[PDB]
UniProtKB/Swiss-Prot annotation, chain F:
Family (UniProt): Belongs to the peptidase T1B family.
Upper taxonomic lineage: Eukaryota, Fungi, Dikarya, Ascomycota, Saccharomycotina
Name assigned to this protein: Proteasome subunit beta type-1
Gene field: PRE3
Organism: Saccharomyces cerevisiae (strain ATCC 204508 / S288c)
Keyword Nucleus: yes
SUPFAM superfamilies in UniProt: N-terminal nucleophile aminohydrolases (Ntn hydrolases)
Catalytic reactions on record: Cleavage of peptide bonds with very broad specificity
Length: 244, 198, 243, 222, 244, 196, 250, 204, 233
C-alpha cells in the first residue's frame, strides 16, 4: 500500500527510509558549505546569507570547533547541527579522558556516524536535518569527512553540500585534476573563497558573507582556527577577481 | 520493663498490664492502658520501645479491622496471632525493627475456647495457659506453675492474678503503679474497673 | 489493520513485510561479494565501486576486522553496516574477556543472528538492511564461512555469495564443487585461493577487474587481514598469466 | 582440608581429604570436596564449604549453558575466568579457595583460585589448612614428566601428609583423573586409611529401657 | 511515534461497554463447555474437551480442570495458556494466605483476588485481557460448598448450577429446568452429564472428550475430598448414568 | 615483590621476581608478574595479586576493543586506562603498576602508577616491597640508551639485590624485552644471579 | 528511543479471534514437516533438513535440539524464533529448576515453562507471538516417557504420536493407522522414517533427515565415570550413517 | 548475643533397618528463663520430616516456608517431594540468605518412597549439606549428641531397638545441657507407618 | 498533503519541512508587536501590551533575566515564563560557579539548544513564543532574536509579532542612525518608539499600553511602564 513515509524507522517496499530522504530535502534547501583537504590540513568555508542589513556583520558564526583540532560546518537545520556538535564534543571529551590522546579524526567520524545512524532506527525520533563537513589533523595527517542524515559518511578530497552543492563539486573536481601533487593550506583557503563565491549564483538573489576556518599542521600547528583579518580579505579579493 | 501478664482459664483469657509510664527520673502517667482491641473477641497487650509500641499496636489494629470490614467476619485468634508474628518476623530483619513484645488474648467463637499467645519482637510465638513479657516472668511463671489449674473460673483467675500482682509489688524494683485488668470471653472484652482493691 | 506492513508483526499470510523490505535494502549498494574456503585459509572478495572523484578511495570499504581472527564483509548500506560492525567488535571483545578465549566465528554469527531475530519480534527496533558474512580459520573448526540476514537466520557454508548477482556466482561455485567433489579449494597458499575467488568472480559476472574494482580479505590461522590495491594488482597479474 | 593438583605427561589429577569441621568438631567425616564443573573439568574446593559448593554449581551451570550455546567442549580457562571474576566481585566475602583442573580441546590444565579472585598456574598445587604438609611432599617428590600412575601416587601421598599432620584434615582420599583422550575418572574414596576399629561392646539397649509418656500413629497419606 | 499502532484495549464504547472484554467473551463462547453444579453434599465439575484425536494422550491430558488448593478447583473456558497464567498466581495466593494466617484460604477470597487481576487489565496498562472464564468449585468452613464464576471483565458471582463456554444458553435452560435445591452429589453428577450430552456439538458424548471432578466430604472421615476423575472413571460413570 | 622497567637504546625491558606470599608463606615461587595487555605494551604488577590481575584483565579488554575500532593503541593510552582504573577506585585497590611499551616512533616508554593513582613517565622505574632496597643502587647505575646487554645486566643486578634483602621477593628473575624485533622472554635462576 | 510500544500487539477482534496468533499458526503450517512418536521404551522426534542452498552445510544447523540430557525438541515454522526459544528453554531449566532442586526438571514442567514464555509474547507490550510449534519429547523417573506439542498461543498437549507443519494432516492420518500402545522404540523409529518419506520431495537420506530419540541411559556419552547414580543422558541424536542403515530396511 | 543460644533445643536423626528416627526436645527458653515445654522442633511435608534447632522465630519461619514450597511442588509435580530432593530445596533456600542467614540447624529424615531407602541429612546455617548414613545431630547440645551417637550407635537396628538407642542419645545429651530438655518426642518412621512417642525425662 | 505530516514534531514533510514547528512559529505572528534595537552603549526593547477587555489589565511583555540581561516576548506567555526562567538559571549558574556574567551570545546558544530538544523527540511540542533579548556584557551591547525553531540571531535591531514588518523596514532604514546613538538612552528609546509605531493600526500607544526596557554601559536592565513611559508618547 502506501504510508511508508509517515514513520521514521519504516522500510518501503523498495527498501528505502523516506523520512531520511525527506531530511535530505531540508539539507539541500540550506546554505552551501564546503571542505577542502590540503597537503597538511583541511580548510572549511561556508555561505552566510544576509537576510537583511540588520544582521551584525561577522557575528553569527556558523563553523564550530570540536576539542581543539577539529572543525565542523553543516547545511540545513542549524539547530540540528549544533545538537550534533554538542554530541561530538561530549564524544571527544569521553575519548580523551580515557585514552588521554585527543580523538583521531577517523574515530571522531564514526562517533558522529553511529549517533546519526541511531536516529534512523526508531519512530520516536526524527533523523538529523543536516549534512556535516568536518575534519582535522591527527597522528597520521589531515582528514576531511562529510556525514549525511542517513548516517553515511566517507573520507573526501573535497566536499560540498547545500543549495550550490553542484557548482562546488564541479569546482572541487577541477582542483583535484589540476593538483595531483596536492594543494597548500594557503591555496586551499583562497580556492575555498572562490568556490563559495561561484556557488553563490544558485542564490544570487540575497547578498552573503563569507566565513573560513582551517586546521593545518604548518599554518596553525594542528589546531583549528578561523581565517580572519588580512588573510581573509586577501581571499575575498582573489575570489571577487575571478568572479569577473 | 512494664508488666504484661496473661492467663487463660476455663472460658476466658485475662490480661493485666502496668499503668506506669516512667521516663528517666519521672513517672509521667499512672493510668496508661497498654492495650488495643483488634476485634470484638481479640485483645492485645504490649511493652517495649517508647514509640514502636503504639505505632505497632495501632498498625495491627487497623489491619485486623480492615480485614473485618472487607470479609464481614472476625478472624480467629490463631489467625490474628499468626498475622502478628509474621509482621514482627519481617520487622526483625528490617532497617529499623519494632522493639515490641505482645500478649494476644482472644476468645475463639468457633471452637468456643479462650486462647493466649505470647509473641516477642523476634517473632517468637507460643501458645500458653499463662505468659508474661519482661522481668515479671521471673516471678510469675513458677507462681502459676504452682497455683494454676485448667478448669479454673474467671473469678479464680482474677485471684490468681492478684496473687501475681502482689508478688510483683513486693519483689520488683520499680513502682509500676498497679495494673489494669481485662477479660476476654464469649461476650467480648471488658475491664475489671475494681482491682485496685479486689 | 494495513499496518502489518510498517512494523514487525504478522500479516494474514504469516509474513513479516518489514523483514522482506529489509532484505531489499541489502542490494542498495549494487555490490557482490563471495567467500571460499582454502585448505587452511578463508577468502572474501567484494566489488568496490567508488564513482565520485572527490572521495578518498582508501576510506571506502565494506570489509571489517572484528577481531584478530574474525573478518566480516557486509552487503548493504554503510551506516547499518557500521552499526553491525561496531556491535560485533564489542561482542567479540566482551566474549574474550568473560570466557577467556577468542570468540569463534560461528558463535559470533549466532549472536548477531539472535540480535537480528529480536528486531524481528520487537516493534520499536527496525531490522538492519544488511547481510553479514563472517570468516576465520577457527582453532577448532578450521576455515569458516557463516552468514546472517535481516531475518535472524544463519548457516555455515562451503562457500557463498551475496549481492544483486548472487545467483550467478552461486551456481558457478556450485558447479565447481559438483566437479571437484571436495568442499574447499585444495590450495595451500592463500594467494592462490584469492586468485581462485577472483577468477570465478570474473567468470560468473562476465567482467574484468582492475586493482581498484575489488576489496579482498583473508583469514589465516591466528590472523585476518585485508589486501592493498597493490597486493591485489599482483594477484590480478597472476590470473592474467594463465588466460 | 587438604586439596592438591598434579599434572602428568598426558593429563592432570586432583585429590582431597574428606574432613569437614565446625571449630574442633568433625562435622562430616566423609564429605566430597571434588566437584564436577563439566564432564572433564573438575574442581577441588577448600574454605567455606557452602561457598565452594555454591560457586562451583553456579559456574558449572553456566558452563553447561555456554557449552550448549557454542556447541563446543567447555575449556578450563572459561571456568577459571568465570570463577575469578565472580569471587572478585565479592571482595573475598565468598570464602572459596579452589584448584580447578581438566582437559579440553586445548590440552590439560592446572590452576588455583583464591577467595579474593587471584589465579595461579602450575604443575603442582595445594590449598587448605593441610596446604603445607601436602606441598612439602610435592616439593620433595614432583618431577617433570610423570606417568598417570606416578601422579596419582604423588597426589595421594600429599593428601595423606595433610590427613596425618593437619588437625583440619583427615579420613579418606578422593581422586579424579583427567587424561587428554579419555573420560575423566572420579575415584571416590580411593583410599580409606581411617576405618574405625571394632567397638569393644554393643550398646544395644533391652527394649523397654526408655520411659514413654504417650504414644500415637502419624498420618502421612493425604 | 507508537501511538499509531495502539489498539487502546482499555476504553469505553459510546454505549459504555468495554470492547476487548466483549470480544474476549465472544472468544469464550466458542470454547468447550464447562459445567458446575452444587449439591447439598458436594459439588460437581464437568467440561467438554474441545478438539480431540485418536492419538491424543488423554491419561496425561488436562485442558479444563485444574486443582488450585486441596479444597478448591476450577474449570476453564477460553485460552488455556491465559488460564495457566492466572491459575499459577491463584496457587501462590492460597499458599500466601496459609503462610500468613495458618488457615486455608476462604474460597471467596481466592476468587476475588483472581477477579481483581482480570479487572486490572481492563482499566490500565494497554494490554489485552485474559480470554478466560472460570467456574470455581470449593469448600471452606464459613460457607461450605460454593460455586463461583469469573469472566474477562473481572466480575464474579455465585451459582447453584452454571455453565461457561459454548452453548451456555441451551445448557442454562436445561439446568434451570431440572435443578432442585435438595439434590445429592450423584444427582448433580447425572444432571451435569445429561446437559453436556444435549448441548454437545459432537456426535456422541464419549469419555475421551470429558474431564470430570467432584468435591465431596467422604462421610467415613469428616474431611472434604477433591477427585479429578481419570479416563476410566469417566468411562464408568458414563455407562451408569445411561449414556454408555 | 620486586619489579622494574627500563628504557634503553632499542626499546624497553621489564623485570620481576617470582614470589607471591600470604604472610611468610610463599604461595607461589614461580609467579609471572610480567603481564601482556597488548602486542607491545606490557606491565609489571605489584601489590594485590587479585587486584592487579583484575585490573590487567580489564585493561587488556579495553585495548582489544580500542584496537578493533581505532587501530594500535599507544603506550601512553595503555598507561591512561590503567591510571583511570587505579585512580577512580583508589579506595578499594592495592595495585602498584609499571607500564612499559615499545613504539616505532617513541621507541621505549615507561609509566609508573603508584598507589594513589597518579601517573609518572620516566626513563625507568622500580616498584614493589623490594624496590626500597635498590633506590641508591639503581640511581647510581642507570644510564640512558644502554644496550640490550647492559640493560639486562642492570636489571639482573638490581633485582638480585632486591631479592637478597626483601623476604617478599625471590625465586627466579623474569624479563621481557620489547623492541622493533619483537618480544623476547628471559628467565634467570638463583644459581646465576645470587652470586653476582 | 526507549520502547514506547508498551501496549499489546495482539488483541481480540470482534469475532473473538486473536489475529496475530492465528497468523503465527499459519506460518507454522507453511513450515517443513516435523513429527513425534512415543513407544513403550522411548520417544522419537524427526524432521527434514530443508537445505536452503547446496553450498550450505546442513550439519551446521540443528532442528532437533537437546534441552536437558533427557529432553529434546524439534519444530515447524520460523527457525530463528525456535533457535532463541531453545536458548531460553535450556536456561530456564536451570534458573527455575536445577538451581533449586539440583536435578533437571520433568518433561511436563519444562514444557510448561517454554509454553509460558510463548504465552507472554502473546500479551506483553511491543511484541509479536513466536511463529513456531514445538514437539518436545523426554523422560523423567516419575513420569516415564512423554511427548508434547506447544503452539504459538502458549497451549500445549500430550501426544502418543503426531506431526506439525506442511503435510501434518496426511502425516497424522498415517500415524493413526500405524500406532499402537505396544510399539518398541525401533518400531517407532521405523514408522517415523516411513511417515517422513511421504512428506519429502527430493533426496531422502541421513543427510537430509534429522532424527533423535529419548531412550535408555547412555553411560558412554557421560564423559566421566565414578558416580553410580549418574548413568548417562537418555537423549541421543542419530548419525547420518545410523539413518541410512535403517533406510535399507525401509 | 549468639542467636543460636537464645532459645535452646536439640534434634537428632538416626538410620536403622528399613527405617529412620528423628527426635527433639520440647524446650523453648529465653536465656535462663524456660518459657514453653511444648515447643516441638520436628515437622513433616508428606512423608519427609524436618527438624530445626536454633532461633525459634527462624524455626517457625522455615517451617512455614517449606510447607508453602512443598505444597506448590505437589501441585505442579503431582507427587509428594522426596527426601533427597527436599534436602536440595533446603540447601538452596538457606544459601539464598548467605549473608544474612537464618540461625538454624536443619535435619532431614525419611524413606524414599520409590527406592524404600532410608535417608537423613544435616545442614549448617548457610546450607552446607551433610548426608550421613548413620546419624545427624544438631542444637545447643550437639557435642553431647555426637558423643552419645558415636558410642551408642550401630548399623541396621530394628525399629524397636533404634527407638531405644536414639532416645538414650537424646536424653543423656540434654541432661548435660542447661538449654535443652524439658520433654522430648521421638519419631519412628517405616515405609508403611510412623509412630510418635513422648519420652519421660528430668524437668530441671 | 500537509495534514499527513503535521501530527507531531518527529515527522518531516516530503519537502523537508517541520509543520508543528511552523504552526508554532505562527503563534508568534499572532502576537502583539515588540521592537528591539541597540547602539554601542545601550540596547532597548519596546513592546505593545495587549489587553482582553477594557476591564482587564495589559499583559506584561518584558521580563528581566539578570542585571545585565532581559527580553521581550511575542506568543504564548507561559512558554516565555519557562524560557526566561531557564535563562535566569543559566545567568545565575554562570555567576555562582564562575563569578562570570553570562555573555548574551552564550545565552543565545543555550536557548537555541533548549528549543531544539523539543523538535526531534516524540511527545514534546515546540515552544510557541518568540523572544528578543538585549544585554550588556564584556563585548558591549547586544540584541538577539529567538525563534521556536531554535534559530537565534544577533542583530542591530528587529521586531516580531503582528504587523512587525512595519517597524522592521523602518529600522532597516534608520540603521546607520540609531546604531550611533551612544551615551543618550532617551534618543535610542525614541527611535524605538518610532519604530514600533510603524506597526500600529488599531490604535495609538498610550501610557498603560506601552512597555519599554533598556540596558547598557552603566545601566542595569530596567523596565518602564505607565507614567514611566509618559515622557515618550
Amino acid at each position: 500500500g502506501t504510508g511508508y513515509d509517515l514513520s521514521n524507522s519504516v522500510f518501503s517496499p523498495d527498501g528505502r527510509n523516506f523520512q531520511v530522504e525527506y531530511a535530505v530535502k531540508a539539507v539541500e534547501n540550506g546554505t552551501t558549505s564546503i571542505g577542502i583537504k590540503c597537503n597538511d590540513g583541511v580548510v572549511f568555508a561556508v555561505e552566510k546569507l544576509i537576510t537583511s542589513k540588520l544582521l551584525v556583520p561577522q557575528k553569527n558564526v556558523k563553523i564550530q570547533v570540536v576539542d581543539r583540532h577539529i572543525g565542523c560546518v553543516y547545511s540545513g537545520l542549524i539547530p540540528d547541527g549544533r545538537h550534533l556538535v554538542n554530541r561530538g564534543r561530549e564524544e571527544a571529551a569521553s575519548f580523551k579522558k580515557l585514552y588521554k590522546t585527543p580523538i583521531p579524526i577517523p574515530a571522531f567520524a564514526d562517533r558522529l556516524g553511529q549517533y546519526v545512524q541511531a536516529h534512523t532506527l526508531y519512530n520516536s525520533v526524527r533523523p538529523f536535518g543536516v549534512s556535516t563537513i568536518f575534519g582535522g589533523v591527527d597522528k597520521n595527517g589531515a582528514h576531511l569527512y562529510m556525514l549525511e542524515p542517513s548516517g553515511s559518511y566517507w573520507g573526501y578530497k573535497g566536499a560540498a553540500t547545500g543549495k550550490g552543492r553542484q557548482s562546488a563539486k564541479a569546482e572541487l573536481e577541477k582542483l583535484v585534476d589540476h593538483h595531483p601533487e596536492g594543494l597548500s593550506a594557503r591555496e586551499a583557503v583562497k580556492q575555498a573563497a572562490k568556490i563559495i563565491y561561484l556557488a553563490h549564483e544558485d542564490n544570487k538573489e540575497k547578498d552573503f558573507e563569507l566565513e573560513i576556518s582551517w586546521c593545518s599542521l604548518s599554518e596553525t600547528n594542528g589546531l583549528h582556527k578561523f581565517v580572519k583579518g588580512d588573510l581573509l580579505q586577501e581571499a575575498i579579493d582573489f575570489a571577487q577577481k575571478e568572479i569577473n | 520493663m512494664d508488666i504484661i501478664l496473661g492467663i487463660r482459664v476455663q472460658d476466658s483469657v485475662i490480661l493485666a498490664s502496668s499503668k506506669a509510664v516512667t521516663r528517666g527520673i519521672s513517672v509521667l502517667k499512672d493510668s496508661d492502658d497498654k492495650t488495643r482491641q483488634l476485634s470484638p473477641h481479640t485483645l492485645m497487650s504490649f511493652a517495649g520501645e517508647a514509640g514502636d509500641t503504639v505505632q505497632f499496636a495501632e498498625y495491627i489494629q487497623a489491619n485486623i479491622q480492615l480485614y473485618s470490614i472487607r470479609e464481614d467476619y472476625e478472624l480467629s485468634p490463631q489467625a490474628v496471632s499468626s498475622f502478628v508474628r509474621q509482621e514482627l518476623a519481617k520487622s526483625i530483619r528490617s532497617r529499623r525493627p519494632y522493639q515490641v513484645n505482645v500478649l494476644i488474648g482472644g476468645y475463639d467463637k468457633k471452637k468456643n475456647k479462650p486462647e493466649l499467645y505470647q509473641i516477642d519482637y523476634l517473632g517468637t510465638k507460643v501458645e500458653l495457659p499463662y505468659g508474661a513479657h519482661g522481668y515479671s516472668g521471673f516471678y510469675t511463671f513458677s507462681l502459676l506453675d504452682h497455683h494454676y489449674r485448667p478448669d479454673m473460673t474467671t473469678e479464680e483467675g482474677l485471684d490468681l492474678l492478684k496473687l501475681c500482682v502482689q508478688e510483683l509489688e513486693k519483689r520488683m524494683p520499680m513502682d509500676f503503679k498497679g495494673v489494669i485488668v481485662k477479660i476476654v470471653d464469649k461476650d467480648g472484652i471488658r475491664q475489671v474497673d475494681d482491682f485496685q482493691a479486689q | 489493520a494495513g499496518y502489518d506492513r510498517h512494523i514487525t508483526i504478522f500479516s494474514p499470510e504469516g509474513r513479516l513485510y518489514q523483514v522482506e523490505y529489509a532484505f531489499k535494502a541489502t542490494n542498495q549498494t549494487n555490490i557482490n561479494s563471495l567467500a571460499v574456503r582454502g585448505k587452511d585459509c578463508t577468502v572474501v572478495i567484494s566489488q568496490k565501486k567508488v564513482p565520485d572523484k572527490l572521495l578518498d578511495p582508501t576510506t571506502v570499504s565494506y570489509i571489517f576486522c572484528i577481531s584478530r581472527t574474525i573478518g566480516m564483509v557486509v552487503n548493504g548500506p554503510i551506516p547499518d553496516a557500521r552499526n553491525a560492525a561496531l556491535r560485533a567488535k564489542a561482542e567479540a571483545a566482551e566474549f574474550r574477556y568473560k570466557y577467556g578465549y577468542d570468540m569463534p566465528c560461528d558463535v559470533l554469527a549466532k549472536r548477531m543472528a539472535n540480535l537480528s531475530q529480536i528486531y524481528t519480534q520487537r516493534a520499536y527496533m527496525r531490522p538492519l538492511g544488511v547481510i553479514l558474512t563472517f570468516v576465520s580459520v577457527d582453532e577448532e573448526l578450521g576455515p569458516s564461512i557463516y552468514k546472517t540476514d535481516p531475518a535472524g537466520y544463519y548457516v555455515g557454508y562451503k562457500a557463498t555469495a551475496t549481492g544483486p548477482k548472487q545467483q550467478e556466482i552461486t551456481t558457478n561455485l556450485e558447479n565447481h564443487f559438483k566437479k571437484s567433489k571436495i568442499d574447499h579449494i585444495n590450495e595451500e597458499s592463500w594467494e592462490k585461493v584469492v586468485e581462485f575467488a577472483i577468477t570465478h568472480m570474473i567468470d560468473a559476472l562476465g567482467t574484468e577487474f582492475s586493482k581498484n574494482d575489488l576489496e579482498v580479505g583473508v583469514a589465516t590461522k591466528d590472523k585476518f587481514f585485508t589486501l592493498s590495491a597493490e597486493n591485489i594488482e599482483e594477484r590480478l597479474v597472476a590470473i592474467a598469466e594463465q588466460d | 582440608t587438604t586439596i592438591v593438583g598434579v599434572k602428568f605427561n598426558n593429563g592432570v589429577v586432583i585429590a582431597a581429604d574428606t574432613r569437614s569441621t565446625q571449630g574442633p568438631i568433625v562435622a562430616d567425616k566423609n564429605c566430597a570436596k571434588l566437584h564436577r564443573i563439566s564432564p572433564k573439568i573438575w574442581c577441588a574446593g577448600a574454605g567455606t564449604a557452602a561457598d565452594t559448593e555454591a560457586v562451583t554449581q553456579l559456574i558449572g551451570s553456566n558452563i553447561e549453558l555456554h557449552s550448549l550455546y557454542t556447541s563446543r567442549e567447555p575449556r578450563v580457562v572459561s571456568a577459571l575466568q568465570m570463577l575469578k571474576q565472580h569471587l572478585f566481585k565479592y571482595q573475598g566475602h565468598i570464602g572459596a579457595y579452589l584448584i580447578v583442573a581438566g582437559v579440553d580441546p586445548t590440552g590439560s590444565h592446572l590452576f588455583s583460585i583464591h577467595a579474593h579472585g587471584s589465579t595461579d598456574v602450575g604443575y603442582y598445587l595445594s590449598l587448605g589448612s593441610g596446604s603445607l604438609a601436602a606441598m612439602a611432599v610435592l616439593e620433595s617428590h614432583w618431577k617433570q614428566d610423570l606417568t598417570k600412575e606416578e601422579a596419582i601416587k604423588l597426589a595421594s601421598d600429599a593428601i595423606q601428609a595433610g590427613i596425618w599432620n593437619d588437625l583440619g584434615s583427615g579420613s579418606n582420599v578422593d581422586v579424579c583423573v583427567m587424561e587428554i583422550g579419555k573420560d575423566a575418572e572420579y575415584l571416590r574414596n580411593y583410599l580409606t586409611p581411617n576405618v574405625r576399629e571394632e567397638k569393644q561392646k554393643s550398646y544395644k539397649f533391652p527394649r523397654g529401657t526408655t520411659a514413654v509418656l504417650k504414644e500415637s500413629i502419624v498420618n502421612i497419606c493425604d | 511515534g507508537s501511538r499509531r499502532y495502539d489498539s487502546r484495549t482499555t476504553i469505553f464504547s459510546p454505549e459504555g461497554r468495554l470492547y476487548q472484554v466483549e470480544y474476549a467473551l465472544e472468544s469464550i463462547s466458542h470454547a468447550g463447555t464447562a459445567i458446575g453444579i452444587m449439591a447439598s453434599d458436594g459439588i460437581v465439575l464437568a467440561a467438554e474437551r474441545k478438539v480431540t484425536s485418536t492419538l491424543l494422550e488423554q491419561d496425561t491430558s488436562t485442558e479444563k480442570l485444574y486443582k488450585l488448593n486441596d479444597k478448591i478447583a476450577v474449570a476453564v473456558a477460553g485460552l488455556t495458556a491465559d488460564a495457566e497464567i492466572l491459575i499459577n498466581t491463584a496457587r501462590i495466593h492460597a499458599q500466601n494466605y496459609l503462610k500468613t494466617y495458618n488457615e486455608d484460604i476462604p474460597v471467596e477470597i481466592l476468587v476475588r483476588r483472581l477477579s481483581d487481576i482480570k479487572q486490572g487489565y481492563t482499566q490500565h496498562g494497554g494490554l489485552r485481557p485474559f480470554g478466560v472464564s472460570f467456574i470455581y468449585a470449593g469448600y471452606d468452613d464459613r460457607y461450605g460448598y460454593q460455586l463461583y464464576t469469573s469472566n474477562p471483565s473481572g466480575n464474579y458471582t455465585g451459582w447453584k448450577a452454571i455453565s461457561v463456554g459454548a452453548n451456555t444458553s441451551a445448557a442454562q435452560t436445561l439446568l434451570q429446568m431440572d435443578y432442585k435445591d435438595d439434590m445429592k452429589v450423584d444427582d448433580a453428577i447425572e444432571l451435569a452429564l445429561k446437559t453436556l450430552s444435549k448441548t454437545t456439538d459432537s456426535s456422541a458424548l464419549t469419555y475421551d472428550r470429558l474431564e470430570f471432578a467432584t468435591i465431596r466430604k467422604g462421610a467415613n472421615d469428616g474431611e472434604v475430598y477433591q477427585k479429578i476423575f481419570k479416563p476410566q472413571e469417566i468411562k464408568d460413570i458414563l455407562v451408569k448414568t445411561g449414556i454408555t | 615483590t620486586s619489579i622494574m622497567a627500563v628504557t634503553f637504546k632499542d626499546g624497553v625491558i621489564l623485570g620481576a621476581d617470582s614470589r607471591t606470599t600470604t604472610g611468610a608463606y610463599i604461595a607461589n615461587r614461580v609467579t609471572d608478574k610480567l603481564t601482556r595487555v597488548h602486542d607491545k605494551i606490557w606491565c609489571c604488577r605489584s601489590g594485590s595479586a587479585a587486584d592487579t590481575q583484575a585490573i590487567a584483565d580489564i585493561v587488556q579488554y579495553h585495548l582489544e576493543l580500542y584496537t578493533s575500532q581505532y587501530g594500535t593503541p599507544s603506550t601512553e593510552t595503555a598507561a591512561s586506562v590503567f591510571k583511570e582504573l587505579c585512580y577512580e577506585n583508589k579506595d578499594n585497590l592495592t595495585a602498584g603498576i609499571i607500564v612499559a611499551g615499545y613504539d616505532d616512533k617513541n621507541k621505549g616508554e615507561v609509566y609508573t602508577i603508584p598507589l594513589g593513582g597518579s601517573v609518572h613517565k620516566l626513563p625507568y622505574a622500580i616498584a614493589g616491597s623490594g624496590s626500597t632496597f635498590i633506590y641508591g643502587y639503581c640511581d647510581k647505575n642507570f644510564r640512558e640508551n644502554m644496550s640490550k646487554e647492559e640493560t639486562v645486566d642492570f636489571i639482573k643486578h638490581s633485582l638480585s639485590q632486591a631479592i637478597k634483602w626483601d623476604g617478599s621477593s625471590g625465586g627466579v628473575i623474569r624479563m621481557v624485552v620489547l623492541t622493533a624485533a619483537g618480544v623476547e622472554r628471559l628467565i634467570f635462576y638463583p644459581d646465576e644471579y645470587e652470586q653476582l | 528511543m526507549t520502547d514506547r510500544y508498551s501496549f499489546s500487539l495482539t488483541t481480540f477482534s470482534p469475532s473473538g479471534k486473536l489475529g496475530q496468533i492465528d497468523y503465527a499458526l499459519t506460518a507454522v503450517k507453511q513450515g517443513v514437516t516435523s513429527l513425534g512418536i512415543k513407544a513403550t521404551n522411548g520417544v522419537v522426534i524427526a524432521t527434514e533438513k530443508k537445505s536452503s542452498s547446496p553450498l550450505a552445510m546442513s550439519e551446521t544447523l540443528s532442528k532437533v535440539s537437546l534441552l536437558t540430557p533427557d529432553i529434546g525438541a524439534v519444530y515447524s515454522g520460523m527457525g530463528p524464533d525456535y533457535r532463541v526459544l531453545v536458548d531460553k528453554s535450556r536456561k530456564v531449566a536451570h534458573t527455575s529448576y536445577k538451581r533449586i532442586y539440583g536435578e533437571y526438571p520433568p518433561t511436563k514442567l519444562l514444557v510448561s515453562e517454554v509454553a509460558k514464555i510463548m504465552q507472554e509474547a502473546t500479551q506483553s507490550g511491543g511484541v509479536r507471538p513466536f511463529g513456531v510449534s514445538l514437539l518436545i519429547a523426554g523422560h523423567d523417573e516419575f513420569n516415564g516417557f512423554s511427548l508434547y506439542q506447544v503452539d504459538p498461543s502458549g497451549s500445549y498437549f500430550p501426544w502418543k504420536a503426531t506431526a506439525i507443519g506442511k503435510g501434518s494432516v496426511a502425516a497424522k492420518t498415517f500415524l493413526e493407522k500405524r500406532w499402537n500402545d505396544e510399539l518398541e522404540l525401533e518400531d517407532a523409529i521405523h514408522i517415523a522414517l516411513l511417515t517422513l518419506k511421504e512428506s519429502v520431495e527430493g533426496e531422502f537420506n541421513g543427510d537430509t533427515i534429522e532424527l533423535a530419540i529419548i531412550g535408555d541411559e547412555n553411560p558412554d556419552l557421560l564423559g566421566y565415570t565414578g558416580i553410580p547414580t549418574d548413568k548417562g543422558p537418555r537423549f541421543r541424536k542419530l548419525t547420518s550413517q545410523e539413518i541410512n542403515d535403517r533406510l535399507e530396511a525401509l | 548475643s549468639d542467636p543460636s543460644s537464645i532459645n535452646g533445643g536439640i534434634v537428632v536423626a538416626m538410620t536403622g533397618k528399613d527405617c529412620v528416627a528423628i527426635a527433639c526436645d520440647l524446650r523453648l527458653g529465653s536465656q535462663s528463663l524456660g518459657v514453653s515445654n511444648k515447643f516441638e522442633k520436628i515437622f513433616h511435608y508428606g512423608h519427609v520430616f524436618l527438624g530445626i534447632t536454633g532461633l525459634a522465630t527462624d524455626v517457625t519461619t522455615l517451617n512455614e516456608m517449606f510447607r508453602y514450597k512443598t505444597n506448590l511442588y505437589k501441585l505442579k509435580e503431582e507427587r509428594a517431594i522426596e527426601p533427597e530432593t527436599f534436602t536440595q530445596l533446603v540447601s538452596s533456600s538457606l544459601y539464598e540468605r548467605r549473608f544474612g542467614p537464618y540461625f538454624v540447624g536443619p535435619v532431614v529424615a525419611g524413606i524414599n518412597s520409590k527406592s524404600g531407602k532410608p535417608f537423613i541429612a544435616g545442614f549448617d546455617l548457610i546450607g552446607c549439606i551433610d548426608e550421613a548414613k548413620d546419624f545427624i545431630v544438631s542444637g545447643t547440645a550437639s557435642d553431647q549428641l555426637f558423643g552419645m551417637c558415636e558410642s551408642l550407635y550401630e548399623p541396621n537396628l530394628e525399629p524397636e531397638d533404634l527407638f531405644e538407642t536414639i532416645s538414650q542419645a537424646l536424653l543423656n545429651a540434654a541432661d548435660r545441657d542447661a538449654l535443652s530438655g524439658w520433654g522430648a518426642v521421638v519419631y519412628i518412621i517405616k515405609k508403611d507407618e510412623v509412630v510418635k512417642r513422648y519420652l519421660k525425662m528430668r524437668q530441671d | 498533503f500537509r495534514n499527513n505530516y503535521d501530527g507531531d514534531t518527529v515527522t518531516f514533510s516530503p519537502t523537508g519541512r517541520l509543520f508543528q514547528v511552523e504552526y508554532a512559529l505562527e503563534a508568534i505572528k499572532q502576537g502583539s508587536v515588540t521592537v528591539g534595537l541597540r547602539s554601542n552603549t545601550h540596547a532597548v526593547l519596546v513592546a505593545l501590551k495587549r489587553n482582553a477587555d477594557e476591564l482587564s489589565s495589559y499583559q506584561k511583555k518584558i521580563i528581566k533575566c539578570d542585571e545585565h540581561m532581559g527580553l521581550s516576548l511575542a506568543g504564548l506567555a507561559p512558554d516565555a515564563r519557562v524560557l526566561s526562567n531557564y535563562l535566569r538559571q543559566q545567568c545565575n549558574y554562570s555567576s555562582l560557579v564562575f563569578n562570570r556574567k553570562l555573555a548574551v551570545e552564550r545565552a543565545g546558544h543555550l536557548l537555541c539548544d533548549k528549543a531544539q530538544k523539543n523538535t526531534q523527540s516524540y511527545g514534546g511540542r515546540p515552544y510557541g513564543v518568540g523572544l528578543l533579548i538585549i544585554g550588556y556584557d564584556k563585548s558591549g551591547a547586544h540584541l538577539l532574536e529567538f525563534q521556536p525553531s531554535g534559530n537565534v540571531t544577533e542583530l542591530y535591531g528587529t521586531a516580531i509579532g503582528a504587523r512587525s514588518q512595519g517597524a522592521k523596514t523602518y529600522l532597516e532604514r534608520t540603521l546607520d542612525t540609531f546604531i550611533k546613538i551612544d551615551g543618550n538612552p532617551d534618543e535610542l528609546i525614541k527611535a524605538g518608539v518610532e519604530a514600533i509605531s510603524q506597526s500600529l493600526r488599531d490604535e495609538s500607544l498610550t501610557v498603560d499600553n506601552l512597555s519599554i526596557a533598556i540596558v547598557g554601559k552603566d545601566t542595569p536592565f530596567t523596565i518602564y511602564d505607565g507614567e514611566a513611559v509618559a515622557k515618550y508618547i
